[PDB]
C-alpha cells in the first residue's frame, strides 16, 4: 500500500460518510447509491453491510470499507458504471461529465483536479475516457 492510495481510499470513505462521524450507515450508502442512479432497498443496503461487518455493529468503519473493496476485487457491471458517467451516451466520458458526477456525489473540484483525473484514466491521450479505458481503471 502507498500513502497516496491510502489518501484516495480516505477521500472515498468521506464521500459516503456525509455527516463526518467516521462511520458509514445504510442511509449514507443509500444516499450515495441513489445519487449514482440506483435505487437500493433497505434489505439490499443491510445485506451489503452485513457481508463485511466484522464487529456486528451494523455500520461500516474504515477497515471494513476497505474490505468491501477487496471483496469486489476478488463486466456487465462495468458497462453500467460507465453509463453513469457517459451521460450523452457518446462512448466517451468528458471532463464535464466527470465533474457532473462528482458534483452529484457532493464533491467540490477545481477545473485542474477534474482534468488531472481524466488524465490519469486516459490511455490513448485523446483527453476523454472511453469504455476500454474505464474497464482498465475498474480492473
Amino acid at each position: 500500500l502507498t500513502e497516496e492510495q491510502i489518501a484516495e481510499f480516505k477521500e472515498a470513505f468521506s464521500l459516503f460518510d456525509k455527516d463526518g462521524d467516521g462511520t458509514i450507515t445504510t442511509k449514507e450508502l443509500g444516499t450515495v447509491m441513489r445519487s449514482l442512479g440506483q435505487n437500493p432497498t433497505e434489505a439490499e443496503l443491510q445485506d451489503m453491510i452485513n457481508e463485511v461487518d466484522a464487529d456486528g455493529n451494523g455500520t461500516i468503519d474504515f477497515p471494513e470499507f476497505l474490505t468491501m473493496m477487496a471483496r469486489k476485487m476478488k463486466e456487465e457491471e462495468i458497462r453500467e458504471a460507465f453509463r453513469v458517467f457517459d451521460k450523452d451516451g457518446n462512448g466517451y466520458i468528458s471532463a464535464a461529465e466527470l465533474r457532473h458526477v462528482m458534483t452529484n456525489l457532493g464533491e467540490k473540484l477545481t477545473d485542474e483536479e477534474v482534468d488531472e483525473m481524466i488524465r490519469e484514466a486516459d490511455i490513448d491521450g485523446d483527453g476523454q475516457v472511453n469504455y476500454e479505458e474505464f474497464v482498465q481503471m475498474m480492473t
Binding site: 492510495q5 470513505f13 437500493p40 439490499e44 458504471a81 462528482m102 483525473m117 490519469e120 484514466a121
Partner: peptide, 23 residues
Amino acid sequence: HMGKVYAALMIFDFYKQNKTSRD
C-alpha cells in the same frame, strides 16, 4: 486522484453483487 472514484465504484459494484430482484 482518480483513486477515490475507483473506490466509490467498488462499493457501488459491491452493492450490485448484493441486489435482490422484484418482490
